[PDB]
Design an enzyme around this catalytic site. Structure first.
Site, PDB file in Angstrom:
ATOM      1  N   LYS A   6       0.822  -1.243   0.000  1.00  0.00           N
ATOM      2  CA  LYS A   6       0.000   0.000   0.000  1.00  0.00           C
ATOM      3  C   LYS A   6       0.846   1.279   0.000  1.00  0.00           C
ATOM      4  O   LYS A   6       0.645   2.171   0.826  1.00  0.00           O
ATOM      5  CB  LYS A   6      -0.855   0.039   1.274  1.00  0.00           C
ATOM      6  CG  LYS A   6      -1.685  -1.181   1.610  1.00  0.00           C
ATOM      7  CD  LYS A   6      -0.961  -2.364   2.251  1.00  0.00           C
ATOM      8  CE  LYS A   6      -1.690  -3.170   3.311  1.00  0.00           C
ATOM      9  NZ  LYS A   6      -1.436  -2.874   4.766  1.00  0.00           N
TER      10      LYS A   6
ATOM     11  N   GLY B  59       8.091  -3.223 -21.638  1.00  0.00           N
ATOM     12  CA  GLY B  59       8.836  -4.488 -21.819  1.00  0.00           C
ATOM     13  C   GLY B  59       7.946  -5.742 -21.742  1.00  0.00           C
ATOM     14  O   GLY B  59       8.206  -6.594 -22.598  1.00  0.00           O
TER      15      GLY B  59
ATOM     16  N   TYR C  77      15.798  -1.034 -20.835  1.00  0.00           N
ATOM     17  CA  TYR C  77      15.575  -0.503 -22.199  1.00  0.00           C
ATOM     18  C   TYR C  77      16.729  -0.612 -23.179  1.00  0.00           C
ATOM     19  O   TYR C  77      16.773  -0.792 -24.416  1.00  0.00           O
ATOM     20  CB  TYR C  77      15.240   1.013 -22.065  1.00  0.00           C
ATOM     21  CG  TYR C  77      14.091   1.376 -21.064  1.00  0.00           C
ATOM     22  CD1 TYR C  77      12.752   1.118 -21.406  1.00  0.00           C
ATOM     23  CD2 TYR C  77      14.362   1.990 -19.811  1.00  0.00           C
ATOM     24  CE1 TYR C  77      11.704   1.477 -20.538  1.00  0.00           C
ATOM     25  CE2 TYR C  77      13.301   2.345 -18.940  1.00  0.00           C
ATOM     26  CZ  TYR C  77      11.971   2.089 -19.316  1.00  0.00           C
ATOM     27  OH  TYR C  77      10.940   2.433 -18.495  1.00  0.00           O
TER      28      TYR C  77
ATOM     29  N   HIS D 248       7.766   6.731 -14.689  1.00  0.00           N
ATOM     30  CA  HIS D 248       8.167   6.152 -13.398  1.00  0.00           C
ATOM     31  C   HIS D 248       7.817   7.156 -12.298  1.00  0.00           C
ATOM     32  O   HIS D 248       7.731   8.368 -12.545  1.00  0.00           O
ATOM     33  CB  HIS D 248       9.680   5.895 -13.369  1.00  0.00           C
ATOM     34  CG  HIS D 248      10.164   4.905 -14.435  1.00  0.00           C
ATOM     35  ND1 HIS D 248      11.506   4.558 -14.557  1.00  0.00           N
ATOM     36  CD2 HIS D 248       9.506   4.209 -15.400  1.00  0.00           C
ATOM     37  CE1 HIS D 248      11.623   3.698 -15.553  1.00  0.00           C
ATOM     38  NE2 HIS D 248      10.439   3.479 -16.066  1.00  0.00           N
TER      39      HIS D 248
ATOM     40  N   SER E 111       2.040   5.436   2.628  1.00  0.00           N
ATOM     41  CA  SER E 111       0.908   6.316   2.598  1.00  0.00           C
ATOM     42  C   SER E 111       0.327   6.476   3.978  1.00  0.00           C
ATOM     43  O   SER E 111      -0.793   6.976   4.145  1.00  0.00           O
ATOM     44  CB  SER E 111      -0.177   5.807   1.644  1.00  0.00           C
ATOM     45  OG  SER E 111      -0.200   4.388   1.625  1.00  0.00           O
TER      46      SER E 111
ATOM     47  N   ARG F 226     -23.949  20.534  -5.376  1.00  0.00           N
ATOM     48  CA  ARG F 226     -25.138  20.118  -6.135  1.00  0.00           C
ATOM     49  C   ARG F 226     -25.715  21.458  -6.713  1.00  0.00           C
ATOM     50  O   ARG F 226     -25.570  22.526  -6.106  1.00  0.00           O
ATOM     51  CB  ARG F 226     -26.059  19.277  -5.197  1.00  0.00           C
ATOM     52  CG  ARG F 226     -25.297  18.160  -4.394  1.00  0.00           C
ATOM     53  CD  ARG F 226     -26.203  17.055  -3.730  1.00  0.00           C
ATOM     54  NE  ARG F 226     -27.407  16.826  -4.506  1.00  0.00           N
ATOM     55  CZ  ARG F 226     -28.474  16.082  -4.332  1.00  0.00           C
ATOM     56  NH1 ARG F 226     -28.582  15.271  -3.271  1.00  0.00           N
ATOM     57  NH2 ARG F 226     -29.543  16.043  -5.077  1.00  0.00           N
TER      58      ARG F 226
ATOM     59  N   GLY G 169     -29.012  23.019  -4.625  1.00  0.00           N
ATOM     60  CA  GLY G 169     -28.469  23.081  -3.257  1.00  0.00           C
ATOM     61  C   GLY G 169     -27.241  23.995  -2.995  1.00  0.00           C
ATOM     62  O   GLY G 169     -27.020  24.495  -1.853  1.00  0.00           O
TER      63      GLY G 169
END
Ligand SMILES: *[C@@H]1O[C@H](CO[C@H]2O[C@@H](C)[C@@H](O)[C@@H](O)[C@@H]2O)[C@@H](O)[C@H](O[C@@H]2O[C@H](CO)[C@@H](O)[C@H](O)[C@H]2NC(C)=O)[C@H]1NC(C)=O
Ligand SMILES: *[C@@H]1O[C@H](CO[C@H]2O[C@@H](C)[C@@H](O)[C@@H](O)[C@@H]2O)[C@@H](O)[C@H](O)[C@H]1NC(C)=O
Ligand SMILES: [Cu+2]
Ligand SMILES: [Cu+2]
Length: 691
Positions: free
Chosen positions: A73, A124, A192, A253, A259, A465, A468
């Site tokens: 994560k 690749g 590459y 990249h 996180s 909205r 609203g």
């Protein structure tokens, strides 16, 4: 936490060495500190970051995918930029490079020999393989697709492939011994650069690289004229014709960090600086985007021009794009499971109550409709991006934002004609007429008028909205010209606002006094009915809703106890001309016309969504073949769950298939204008992902 020294993760000897030189020109310019950690591979790098033994690593799209997964994560924080100073770009071209002389198209590669940047890599592996799926006659799990690839081409080089299981994939690796066909520099044919070499050396017939490699590696330009590209339309063109000839356009990249407590700013600063001192052509002492004659792409990509900061709403999924993200997970799917997912519509439900009705609808759909959920609309817009949900009906405000996010309107909700038809058998082709935004008050409130609503208590559907918020606040904004929307009224209930602001002041949350000010039906004052309940309960003084709202909620039109005894005549509308009229006169006493709520999806889901929603209304519609002995799609009664309870049907878009054409010029001008007082994190994320 938040910073100090950022521990980078090298994946190589010569990366650590560059990571170490970097360590040094940095504090020697008395810049922010970068310390270096070591490992043999991208995932060890992923594990390290996740167990807090390192803070950052620049990964290929392929590993960003990998890295996002649990229990990692990890989040992209900075993307590399390519192209040049002004033609800077955070994306590249996966191309299929070949030598001139042969004539064999990309549909003529079976039994050819191929050179891959590495297993799991974007240009690749992921793209070229995802691109030729057709030709591979692959059976699907549990047979790895590798086995199907190994049976497609004669011999190949694919750094990281399993030597043992998949002999032929390593076949043309040029490494020596345990180094043959490894995911490292020890393999002449990796990345590459190795892969192009493979091609150059005659080893392979095709190289699956990035568009810049042949320009980066072939100096004389007549040297470059020995290659061409294989276009997806079974063509061959100059290595420079890459915008017209590429397998894909993929995200550059990115540097990923945790996180949770990721040190995102620590990381950003160090990058921001280094890039200043040592970026493209400045301070010979060091070079962040250059590699000692021996190595290539150390720590970052040779010839990147800087970093671009990834807005916080972005994750692996949004980072990758639905096209791509989805493409990586389809590689672990049967062409059956993959076609099943395609035909199926995934609905996104906001809050628990809409899920209930979704489940419910789902159960009765003959597997055409399945459900997804999130707590807000914005969160629901993101799962559609991630291709993890496919559609939802939205208020025009949100159609703008989805719109910016690249989603398109598919069908609009149709309501009771300009009194054109009867239970209009033609409500699929009757063009929409939008609804009426109006300000309501208790009759009783004689003195209250358009001109003196300011500084009193307001009741709003929710922030963003049309009826609203956009309309009421945009009109007032157009007067004062202020962005302090929390100073227009003394206290409100505007769900989806800062629970700590005055703007949440009158929200009541759920039946338990929780969920207060949330932008879903679990907040009692949310939406049309909620905004109106807010007024009828003397919480607020004006309520921004539509006219049909008062009708539908008074005179035993609504049996909730809150609503029972309420009588139409007790409420009135506020006209822009300082007058006051009764709810029956809304046609001449309204703030403005709002565009009908519309259902939005990805362009890839459109025709099928159409088919499904059309079929499905035929059965649970207004005068629905199963409605209402079985299910009424258009009823939650007084709750407007998934759809407005007053939808006559889902009608066709009469050619307005762009959020712009659907929402119209003036409407969009206006939202933009309101958007500058502040943009949502989602809008921020979509801009970033749009360029
Ligand atoms: C992919 O499939 C095509 C045709 O698909 C089926 O071919 C049948 C003949 C059956 O065996 C099915 O079970 C099979 O998957 C194959 O044509 C193709 O490889 C074949 O190309 C070979 C090389 O010329 C040749 O030996 C066969 O004549 C040919 N197909 C024909 C006309 O039979 C498969 N490509 C793969 C597996 O990569
Ligand atoms: C929206 O703004 C238009 C510009 O005139 C307004 O500009 C202010 C700066 C102020 O001096 C006011 O005199 C004007 O209202 C205006 O002409 C439109 O009438 C405005 N109103 C709406 C809601 O359309
Ligand atoms: Cu890459
Ligand atoms: Cu609305």
């Amino acid at each position: 936490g938040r910073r100090r020294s950022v521990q980078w993760c090298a994946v190589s000897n010569p990366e650590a060495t560059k990571c170490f030189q970097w360590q040094r020109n940095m504090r020697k310019v008395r810049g922010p500190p970068v310390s270096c950690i070591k490992r043999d591979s991208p995932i060890q790098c992923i594990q390290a970051i996740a167990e807090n033994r390192a803070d950052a690593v620049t990964l290929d799209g392929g590993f960003i995918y990998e890295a996002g997964l649990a229990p990692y994560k990890l989040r992209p924080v900075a993307a590399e930029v390519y192209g040049t100073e002004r033609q800077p770009r955070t994306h590249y071209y996966a191309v299929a490079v070949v030598k001139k002389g042969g004539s064999f198209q990309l549909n003529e590669l079976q039994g050819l020999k191929s050179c891959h940047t590495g297993l799991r890599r974007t240009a690749g592996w992921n793209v070229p393989i995802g691109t030729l799926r057709p030709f591979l006659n692959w059976t699907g799990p549990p047979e790895p697709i590798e086995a199907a690839v190994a049976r497609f081409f004669s011999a190949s080089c694919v750094p990281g492939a399993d030597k043992g299981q998949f002999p032929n994939l390593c076949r043309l690796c040029a490494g020596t011994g345990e180094n043959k066909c490894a995911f490292s520099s020890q393999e002449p044919y990796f990345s590459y650069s190795g892969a192009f070499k493979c091609l150059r050396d005659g080893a392979g017939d095709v190289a699956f690289i990035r568009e810049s490699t042949v320009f980066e590696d072939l100096s004389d330009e007549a040297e470059r004229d020995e290659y061409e590209l294989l276009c997806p339309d079974n063509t061959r063109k100059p290595v420079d014709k890459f915008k017209d000839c590429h397998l894909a356009r993929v995200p550059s990249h990115a540097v990923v960090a945790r996180s949770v407590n990721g040190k995102e700013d620590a990381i950003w600063n160090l990058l921001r600086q280094a890039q200043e001192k040592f970026g493209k052509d400045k301070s010979p002492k060091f070079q962040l985007f250059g590699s000692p004659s021996g190595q290539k792409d150390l720590l970052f990509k040779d010839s990147a021009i800087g970093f671009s900061r990834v807005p916080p709403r972005i994750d692996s999924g949004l980072y990758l794009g639905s096209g791509y993200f989805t493409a990586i997970q389809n590689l672990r799917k049967s062409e059956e499971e993959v076609a099943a997912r395609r035909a199926r519509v995934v609905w996104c439900a906001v809050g628990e109550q809409e899920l209930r009705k979704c489940n419910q609808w789902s159960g009765l759909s003959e597997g055409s409709v399945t459900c997804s959920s999130a707590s807000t609309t914005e969160d629901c817009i993101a799962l559609v991006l991630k291709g993890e949900a496919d559609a939802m009906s939205l208020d025009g405000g949100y159609v703008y934002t989805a719109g910016k996010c690249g989603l398109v309107p598919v069908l609009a909700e149709n309501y009771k004609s300009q009194q054109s038809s009867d239970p209009d058998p033609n409500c699929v082709d009757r063009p929409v007429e939008g609804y009426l935004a109006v300000a309501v008050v208790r009759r009783s409130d004689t003195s209250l008028t358009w001109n003196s609503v300011k500084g009193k208590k307001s009741c709003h559907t929710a922030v963003d909205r049309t009826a609203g918020w956009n309309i009421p606040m945009g009109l007032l904004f157009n007067q004062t010209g202020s962005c302090k929307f929390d100073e227009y009224f003394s206290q409100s209930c505007a769900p989806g606002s800062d629970p700590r602001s005055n703007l949440c002041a009158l929200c009541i949350g759920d039946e338990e006094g929780e969920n207060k000010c949330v932008p879903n039906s679990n907040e009692r004052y949310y939406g049309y009915t909620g905004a109106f309940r807010c007024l009828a309960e003397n919480a607020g003084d004006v309520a921004f809703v539509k006219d049909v709202t008062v009708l539908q909620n008074t005179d035993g039109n609504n049996n909730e106890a809150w609503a029972k005894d309420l009588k139409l005549a007790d409420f009135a509308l506020l006209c822009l001309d300082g007058k006051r009229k009764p709810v029956t006169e809304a046609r001449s006493c309204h703030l403005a016309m709002a565009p009908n709520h519309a259902v939005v999806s990805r362009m890839d889901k459109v025709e099928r969504l159409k088919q499904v929603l059309l079929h499905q209304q035929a059965k649970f519609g207004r005068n629905g073949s199963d409605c209402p002995d079985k299910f009424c799609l258009f009823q939650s009664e007084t709750k407007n769950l998934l759809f407005n309870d007053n939808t006559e049907c889902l009608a066709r878009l009469h050619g307005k298939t762009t959020y712009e054409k659907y929402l119209g010029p003036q409407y969009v001008a206006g939202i933009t204008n309101l958007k500058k007082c502040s943009t949502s994190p989602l809008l921020e994320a979509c801009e970033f992902l749009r360029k």
